[PDB]
Each structure stands twice: as structure tokens, then as C-alpha cells.
Amino acid sequence: ECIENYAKVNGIYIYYKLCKAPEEKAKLMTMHGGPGMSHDYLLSLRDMTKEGITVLFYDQFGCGRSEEPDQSKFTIDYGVEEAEALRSKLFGNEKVFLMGSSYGGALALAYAVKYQDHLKGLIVSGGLSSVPLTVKEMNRLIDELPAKYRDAIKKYGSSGSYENPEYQEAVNYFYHQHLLRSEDWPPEVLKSLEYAERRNVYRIMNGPNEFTITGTIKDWDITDKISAIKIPTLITVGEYDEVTPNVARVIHEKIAGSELHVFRDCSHLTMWEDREGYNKLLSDFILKHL
């Protein structure tokens, strides 16, 4: 098993899990999405330890097993400083790789803008540089949904009746369509989803659900700042990703030399839909930029 700890990072206790590889060729830090999820759904990335890649997992502020700071700190800027404090505490001055998923991808991009000197490479999976853009794209996904679910989401969503059974059913369909497709949801994914509903960060920073971003990050957009990132960057996105390839395209065009990969038949949690292929792509990227 990996090493689990509860350390004080920037004033609050943060839970982390460090899965070391027998031969530490590289260190990979990971940022779960949400905002307000947990590291659990990214556990399939542990497979990379077999390739000499040490993987660091952690529950961000107010998420999963970590303590919640004052709401005034519920910001991506605070998340960035938290990540850097954790990196330094565990790895000192060693350069590491950083991977982010969904909101975690936006957080990783923000991190790179200020701390890319501490990185050998950046990986963004189903990430975004603009929340407004992400919302625009998900709205199109709702429209392309079969009338039954599309109609329920538009109707009850317009009145804010998120408790309605038909709405809940529509939400579930969307998730099985753009979050994790044609796959039995593993416990690790169920756990992160549960942590989302149990803690407060998801409700406050994000909103009711994935496609309903009413939270404090609704207007967030650093598209005009990511061009500053000049380190090797790998961008992945699923064909049916809830955070669409168009959103990924915008990141790709701003980051010079970045590589973009659209996983056909997959959606957001590509690390579960094509676990082997996903881990193989990331490990290849990492082993080429040591």
C-alpha cells in the first residue's frame, strides 16, 4: 500500500497519499476535479508506479478527508499556493510533473502560470482555461441529449427544482453519457461523488451538479494567461467528455508545443474507460521529459 498522512499545509490539515515507485524516475502530482471532489477517482493512475513514476494524490482544501478553511479561501489562487506548499514539503526543490483533471486541470494551469519552474511537464485531462466556455459547451451537450432528458434538464433546471425525480434521472443519464460511459462505475468514482455531496466545496464553488455551475468559479477564465506556460504539456480529452474537446482545443492553441489527444469513444473519466491506454500515454509523456 501507499503512504497516507495528514499534514498541516498553509494553515490547514490536508490529507495526501504518496505511492512511491521502486525506482523513482519521476514524481507526478495530481489534482482532482470538482471543485469539491476527492483524489479517489484518480486512483487508477497508481498503475504508473510500475513505470518508475511516483504518484502523489491529495484531497484539496475542504475536500474528501481534508479540513475546510474559511470560505474566503475558496479560490483557485489559494488552491495554487496549497499545491506548491505541499510539493515543497514532500519533494523539496525537485522538479515534478503535474496532472490535473476537470477543475483540477484549471488549477494545474493556474499553478503552471506562476510555478512552472518547479515543473518538468504539465498534463491536463478534461481540463479547462475558461468556465464560461465550459458552460457554453455543456449547454450544447444538454441540447444534443435525447428529448426526454434534455427537456427535464431545461424545465426543472429553469425553476431550480434540482430535487425533482425526473431531473435527477436526467442528471444521471448525462453523467453516464459524459462523465463515465459504457462502464460500471467503480467504488473509487462513487466515493469521490459521495465526498462531493458531503462536504461544502462542491456546493459553494461549483454548484448543483457538473452541468450546473452556479458556484463562485462560474466566471473564472485564465485563457489570456496560459500562453505564458512554456513547459512540455500533454492535453487529453474524451470524445464525449463533459468538458468538450473544443474547450481542450483552446488550451492547446495557447500553449506552444502542447500535444492534444482526443480519446474516441471515451468521456471525462478516461482513466477508467481506457485505463491502460491512458496510463500508457501519460507514462510515455513523462519518460520522454525526464
Side-chain angles (χ1 to χ4, degrees), residues 39 44 57 70 72 97 107-108 130 132 135 155 160 163 179 195 228 271 274-275 277 283:
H39 82 287
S44 59
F57 296 101
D70 186 64
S72 71
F97 286 88
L107 181 62
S130 163
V135 166
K155 176 195 289 191
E163 67 287 343
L179 184 68
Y195 273 131
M271 65 291 295
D274 188 3
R275 186 166 174 175
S283 59

Side-chain angles (χ1 to χ4, degrees), residues 20-74:
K20 284 183 178 182
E23 175 168 47
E24 306 197 288
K25 298 180 178 300
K27 306 299 198 312
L28 173 63
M29 186 159 318
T30 63
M31 296 175 155
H32 66 246
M37 298 262 260
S38 66
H39 82 287
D40 299 77
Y41 81 96
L42 293 181
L43 292 174
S44 59
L45 273 66
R46 193 179 160 186
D47 294 350
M48 286 185 266
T49 53
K50 300 179 181 180
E51 312 307 322
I53 302 174
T54 289
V55 183
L56 175 64
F57 296 101
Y58 77 101
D59 287 352
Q60 299 155 206
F61 61 90
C63 304
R65 309 161 185 71
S66 297
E67 93 173 295
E68 185 185 310
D70 186 64
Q71 281 185 50
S72 71
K73 294 166 184 168
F74 282 21

Side-chain angles (χ1 to χ4, degrees), residues 242-267:
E242 66 179 3
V243 186
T244 78
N246 182 228
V247 178
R249 173 190 63 81
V250 167
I251 299 167
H252 180 224
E253 288 169 26
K254 265 59 171 75
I255 306 183
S258 60
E259 316 169 19
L260 170 69
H261 294 272
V262 177
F263 284 70
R264 314 315 211 248
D265 304 324
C266 302
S267 63

Side-chain angles (χ1 to χ4, degrees), residues 37-161:
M37 298 262 260
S38 66
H39 82 287
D40 299 77
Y41 81 96
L42 293 181
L43 292 174
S44 59
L45 273 66
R46 193 179 160 186
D47 294 350
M48 286 185 266
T49 53
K50 300 179 181 180
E51 312 307 322
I53 302 174
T54 289
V55 183
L56 175 64
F57 296 101
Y58 77 101
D59 287 352
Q60 299 155 206
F61 61 90
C63 304
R65 309 161 185 71
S66 297
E67 93 173 295
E68 185 185 310
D70 186 64
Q71 281 185 50
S72 71
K73 294 166 184 168
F74 282 21
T75 74
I76 293 170
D77 286 342
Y78 179 83
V80 171
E81 298 309 318
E82 178 172 83
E84 169 55 12
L86 183 57
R87 184 205 63 74
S88 168
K89 183 267 178 56
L90 299 178
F91 310 122
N93 301 310
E94 181 189 353
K95 284 218 295 180
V96 308
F97 286 88
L98 177 63
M99 168 275 172
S101 158
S102 176
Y103 156 82
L107 181 62
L109 288 169
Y111 177 92
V113 168
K114 187 185 181 180
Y115 293 122
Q116 62 181 128
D117 282 335
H118 293 304
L119 306 181
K120 289 188 166 185
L122 173 67
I123 299 153
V124 179
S125 295
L128 58 118
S129 63
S130 163
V131 179
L133 179 60
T134 300
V135 166
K136 193 188 70 178
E137 290 287 316
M138 289 186 302
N139 282 173
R140 175 181 59 68
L141 293 180
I142 291 167
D143 294 309
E144 311 189 329
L145 234 52
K148 180 193 174 189
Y149 306 103
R150 173 194 61 182
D151 286 27
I153 290 179
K154 297 178 175 179
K155 176 195 289 191
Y156 300 108
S158 282
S159 56
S161 309

Side-chain angles (χ1 to χ4, degrees), residues 135 138 142 153 157 162 167 202 206-215:
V135 166
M138 289 186 302
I142 291 167
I153 290 179
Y162 311 115
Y167 182 78
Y202 193 73
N206 179 274
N209 52 62
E210 292 299 85
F211 56 79
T212 309
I213 311 179
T214 70

